[PDB]
Every structure is written in C-alpha cells, then in structure tokens.
Amino acid sequence: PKYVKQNTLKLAT
Amino acid sequence: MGDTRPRFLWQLKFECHFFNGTERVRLLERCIYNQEESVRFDSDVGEYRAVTELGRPDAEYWNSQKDLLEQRRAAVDTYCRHNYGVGESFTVQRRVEPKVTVYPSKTQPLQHHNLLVCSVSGFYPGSIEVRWFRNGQEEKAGVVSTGLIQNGDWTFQTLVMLETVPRSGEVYTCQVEHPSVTSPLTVEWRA
Amino acid sequence: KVVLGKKGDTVELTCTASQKKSIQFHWKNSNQIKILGNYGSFLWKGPSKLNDRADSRRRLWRQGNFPLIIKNLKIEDSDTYICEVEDQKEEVQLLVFGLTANTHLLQGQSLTLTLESPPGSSPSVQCRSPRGKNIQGGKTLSVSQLELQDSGTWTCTVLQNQKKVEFKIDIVVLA
Amino acid sequence: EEHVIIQAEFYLNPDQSGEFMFDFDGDEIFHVDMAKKETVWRLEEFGRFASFEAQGALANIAVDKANLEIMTKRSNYTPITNVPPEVTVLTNSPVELREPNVLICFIDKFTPPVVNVTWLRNGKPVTTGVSETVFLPREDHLFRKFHYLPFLPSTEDVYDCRVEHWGLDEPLLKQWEF
C-alpha cells in the first residue's frame, strides 16, 4: 500500500 | 537567538476531508505566503480561486490549464480516497484503551470541600465520554474538564474534575466510555 | 466595567492580577456557574450556556492577564461575568448587539433596520448613509423615501453605556 | 466532518529549510528526512503496512523553493511577521514517585518554523532519551511542535523546557516539578 502525493505546481511568472 | 535577517515562508497544503467513510470527500489545495493564504483549489468549487490579490495570477494561469484542472478534479478519488484506504487500518481503525486513575487534588483552596480528579490517558481515538457518579447517581454540576489534549504521539489525555464535599461512606465513580472497550471502564474512590 | 460585542463576532473580557505572574484564576457567569479557569497549567471548562465557545489567552497568563474570550457571540451571551484571581473579584458586564436590514428595496420606499438587543439595555443607534446623512433610531431605525444615492455602505453605530460598536451594512436601492 | 488527511510542505528562506509531511486528524503519519532522502514514520509500525517514495517529496520541495522566490518578489520582498509560541509542559500521565513517565513540551502557535528547545533538569541540559517531532501544521497556518523527555519522578528534581524563537525577546522557560 503506497501513499500518493499531489505534485507542487509552478506559480505564474 | 541571533540572525535577525528577515524570513520568507511558503507553505502548500493538500487537505482531504472525509465525511462518513469515503461517501463524501472534499479536496482543498492551498498556498500560503508567510501567514497569508493567497490562492486555493476547492473540489466543491471545481477551479482555483485567488484568496487575495497576490494569488490572482496563479488562479488565472492554473485555470487556463484544463489538463491540470481535470487532474485536480479526479484527485478526490486518485489521491484522497486512495490515501484513506492506504492507512485505514492503522489510522481510522487505531484503538488504544485509556488508562484511568482517580485521585483527590493535592491542592485544596478550602477545606471541607474537595476536588476529585479523574485522569484519563494514553487513548486513541479522541472520541470519549467521562462521567462522574456519587453513590451511583450521575453528577452533572460541579464537573469541569480540560477537553482533549493531543500528546503528539497518536495518544490523547484528559482531566475531568469533580468538585465535592465528601462524606464518609460515599462512593464516587469515574466512568469512561471509549471505542476501545465494549463496557464502560470505572474506577472508584471511597470517601 | 462594561464591554460591547457584535453578534457572531468574538470579544475579550480582561482580568488582571497584581503581579505579572501566572496564577490560579477562574471565570463565572452571573448564575455563579464556572465557565473556564486553570488547574496548574491545564485549562478547564465547565458546563454552561457558552458550550464550547469560551477560551482564554495562554500567552498572557505569565504576564498576569487571564482573559475570557467568547467566540461566535449570541445575543443571549450578554450577562455579567466575574473573574476570581488572588482573592480579587473583577466584574465585567457584556452586552451583545445585532443589526440587520428588512434584497428588494425600491427607490422612493422606506428602509428599516432592526437592532437585536439584550434584556436591560437602552441603546441609541445612529446610521450614516453613503451620502453622509446621520440618521437616528433605537430598537428600530427607518429611512423615509429612499434614493439611489443611498445604495452602498451604511455605517451604523450603536451607543450603550458611553461605549459604542459599529455595524457596516450594505443596502440595495432599485427603481 | 469525520476525518482529515493533510499533505503539508513548506520552504523557508534564507534558512533554505523545507519540510514534507502527512498528518491524519492532527497526528503526523510520516515526514521525509531531506538529508537522508527517506520516509520517517511517526510510529514504527506504520511503515510495516504502507510506503511512500521519498524522492517525490524532494521534487515537490524544489518546486516550493522556486515558488517561494517568486512570491518573495511578487510581494515586493515583504518578510514574515514573527509570531512567538505558547509553551506548556505536562506529563503524559499522572506522576507516581519512582514510576517512569514522560515530560511533554508543547510549543504551539508560532512562525516561522525555526525554534530551539532544550530540556533542563535542575538547570542543566539533559539529552538522554529525548525526542521531538517536526513542525506540525495548524489551520491558522502557524505551527505546533512536541519535544519529549522520559524521566523518573522525584521530589527534588526541577525541570524546565527552554524555548527560543525570533518572536521572543528572551528565552522562555516553562518549569515543572513533582
């Protein structure tokens, strides 16, 4: 059983 | 403490809120600069919304990304429900029985009266009911409580205190009901 | 000692001890029911009409301050509270007010504001229109013949025991 | 509202410190030790029933670092306002002489996530057996943290949890004794 993470999103630049 | 250079903090939080098992799930994604949440994604809303002017650029930019939006919209399942099932056995189903002790308070502002302390500790989950009885009759007035104190190690404690004027022959009872036991736990103190 | 609060908001009732030191204290309502207080460094709460909406500010304890904080205020939370600390009995009377309009106000018609008040209070109300015309009222306050220029944020001030609380309410005048 | 699972991460400058963790109803499930690139379970047995790929945290933290720089600029370099912690010391159970117990130092409501904590026994620092958690998230976006000291209760010993934080003008000592 593996935890899945949400990926960080790069902000507007 | 030293080093007073100004600090800059950025936090990201993905909160999965569950109602009745996994029947209803709400995903809340938030970005916080210093102590200010600037933008978020609320699954009940379906798209990013700036919380402050500072996050406006991001909400607009991310929302323009329809693929990101769809990924975020399916996360209530692929992320939240998935992770809930992953640790359901040692989290949702964790149960540790409380240790219950009763003692009169070593501190007594005024003789004659008294304070009985029912200490309930080392338990999990938080849901619990602690009641005081006098000769088998429930005492509702004169009782105060600390409420739940999270110890940070997957264990809770609480203190439930009864203000009373004990008379020889009386039997006081602290009773605890918690998911870890099928019958209430009781500890008595005889005046 | 009087303190005013607004329905739904939070309010702080102060309690101070002789010296800046954390010591034993507790708060009671006028029925003498214990509300909150400490036990060593524990914070306890007792059964009361304030359910779980009371709290204090731990940080200040070491500074000799043991405030009673009430959140999501209800009109009926109004009462006289007493803090007992080092044989001292500080009393503070709390009065909670609410103020709302009576969504479809048509130009030319009249606007009426209703002020929720706790028993035993004689409040004076003054609302200022967007234009800037300071009105006057009490348990109720009205404005005859509404104009479009009246739409916007009306700033209403409730006066009680030489103290006041401000309510900002937005009106919508049509045509 | 029945249960809440949170994936919380942060990056702090100029310290160049980042954190990645998961918590369940306020308790930490695990976090990623950034220097060892490994998953650290709050309670050992959790790891016997689940897993998490630590490298993923590493990749998210790099993005968080980059994003902090962006926001730092966008805010015209507005720094964080220090919020000093509330500190309380308690035992995890009622104390009985010569019966093993644990002192808990609870540091709450502070930011930024940088703190110095030291357990003192009769004024001298103690380290044997002590432990601590990483920085835990709060709904108001401040942090909480726990430090622990297993001890043997005695009538003469006096303990202190000494805490230092930028929001405090001097070290804050919270005392405890039987």
Are D50 and D128 in the same domain?
no
Q: Cβ–Cβ of D111/B154 closer than 8 Å? A: no
* DSSP string over C42-76: EEEE--STTTT-EE--HHHHTTTB--EEE-S--GG
CB B143 within 8 A of CB C46: yes
User: Method used for this model?
Assistant: X-ray
Chain C residues touching residue B149 (CB < 8 angstroms):
42
* Site of tokens 């109602």: B19
Tokens found for residue B80: 């939240």
A2, A8, A12 member nearest B12 (Cβ): A8
Q: Domain check: are D90 and D39 in the same one?
A: no
Cα dihedral B15/B17/B23/B24 (nearest 10): -90
Q: Do chains B and C touch (3 or more CB pairs under 8 A)?
A: yes
D93 shares a domain with D55: no
Same domain, D101 and D57: no
Q: How far is CA C125 from CA C4, C10, C149, C166, C169, in A?
A: 14, 21, 21, 10, 13
- Partners of residue D60 in chain B, C-beta under 8 Å: 12
Domain end, chosen from D32, D59, D79, is at D79
Query: What resolution in angstroms, rounded to 1 decimal?
Result: 2.1
CB contact under 8 A, C41 and D84: no
Burial of D156 (0-12, 13-18, 19+ CB in 10 A): exposed
d(CA C129, CA C157) in angstroms, rounded, equals: 12
Which string of DSSP letters, residue by residue, matches B170-182?
A: -EEEEEEE-TT-S
Q: Which helix (H) or strand (E) holds B163?
A: strand B156-163
Q: Are B96 and B78 in contact (CB under 8 A)?
A: no
In CATH terms, the superfamily for domain C1-97 is Immunoglobulins (2.60.40.10)
D12 vs B contacts (CB less than 8 Å): 7-10
Residues D47 and D103 in one domain: no
Q: What angle do CA B182, B185, B190 make, to 5 degrees?
A: 155
Residue D71 host element (H or E)? helix D55-74
Q: At what angle do helices B56-63 and B66-75 cross, to 10 degrees?
A: 90
- Kindly state whether residues D84 and D157 are assigned to the same domain: yes
8 Å CB contact of B90 and D78: no
What is the count of structural domains for chain D?
Answer: 2
Q: For residues C6 and C73, is the Cβ–Cβ distance under 8 A?
A: yes
Topology of the domain covering C98-170? Immunoglobulin-like (2.60.40)
Cα(C99)–Cα(C75) distance, rounded to whole angstroms? 11
Q: Around Cβ C151, how many Cβ atoms within 10 Å?
A: 17
- Main-chain dihedrals φ then ψ at residue B96, nearest 5 degrees: -135, 130
**D45, closest residue in chain B (CA to CA):** B90
Return the SS3 of D57.
helix
The domains spanning C1-97 and C98-170 adopt the same CATH topology? yes
Same domain flag for D136 and D167: yes
Same domain for D174 and D136, yes or no, is yes
| Secondary structure string (H, E, C) spanning C119-130 | CCCCCEEEEECC
β-bridge partners, D106: D88, D146
| Of residues D27, D41, D33, D31, the one with CA closest to residue D146 | D27
User: For D148, what's the count of Cα atoms within 13 Å in the CB-facing half-sphere?
Assistant: 13
Cβ neighbors of C37 (< 8 A, separation 6 or more) are B144, C24, C25, C26, C27, C43, C44
Cβ contact B10:B60 at 8 Å: no
Q: How far apart are CA C135 and CA C158, in angstroms?
A: 12
D59 with D27, same domain?
yes
> Which of D64, D50, D71, D51 minimizes the C-alpha distance to D19?
D64
- What residue in A sits closest to B30 (Cα-Cα)? A8
- Residue from D63, D65, D71, D75 to probe the interface with A (highest A Cβ count within 10 Å): D63
- Pair D3, D67 in one domain: yes
| Interface contact flag, D49 A6, Cβ < 8 Å | no
Would you call A7 and D60 a contact, using CB atoms and an 8 Å cutoff? yes
CB-based contact B158:D90 (threshold 8 Å): no
SS3 D69: helix
What is the CA angle B175-B179-B184, rounded to 5?
Answer: 25
- Work out the minimum CA distance from D79 to partner chain B, whole angstroms: 5
D121 plus D173 within the same structural domain: yes
Could you say which of D11, D45, D79 is where a domain stops?
Answer: D79
> What are A's interface residues with B at a Cβ cutoff of 8 A?
1-6, 8-9, 11-12
B139 within 8 A of B146, measured Cβ to Cβ:
no
**B37 reaches D (C-beta below 8 A):** yes
Judging by DSSP bridges, how do beta strands B129-134 and D143-151 pair with one another? unpaired
- Sort out which chain D residues have CB atoms less than 8 A from B54's CB and list them: 71, 74-75
Report the b/e string of B122-149 with b at 16+ CB within 10 A.
bbbbbebebbbbbeeeebeebbbbbeeb
* Domain chopping of chain C, boundaries: 1-97, 98-170
The two tokens of residue B33 are: 């600069």
Task: Provide CB contacts within 8 A for B110, sequence distance 6+.
Answer: none
D52 and D87 in a common domain: no
Reading the block at residue D148, the tokens are: 């622990």
CA separation, residue C84 to residues B16, B99, B165, C14, D98 (Å): 43, 33, 21, 12, 36
Name the nearest CA neighbour of D90 among B97, B157, B106: B157
Domains detected in chain B: 1-93 (3.10.320.10), 94-191 (2.60.40.10)
β-strand pairing of C163-171 with C152-160: antiparallel
CB D115, CB D107: distance < 8 Å: yes
Residue D50's domain comprises: 1-79
Alpha-carbon gap: A3 to the closest alpha carbon of chain B (Å): 6
Interface of D with B in 76-105 (CB under 8 A): 77-83, 90, 92-94, 104
Tell me the residue length of chain C. 175
CA D60 to the chain's CA centroid: 20
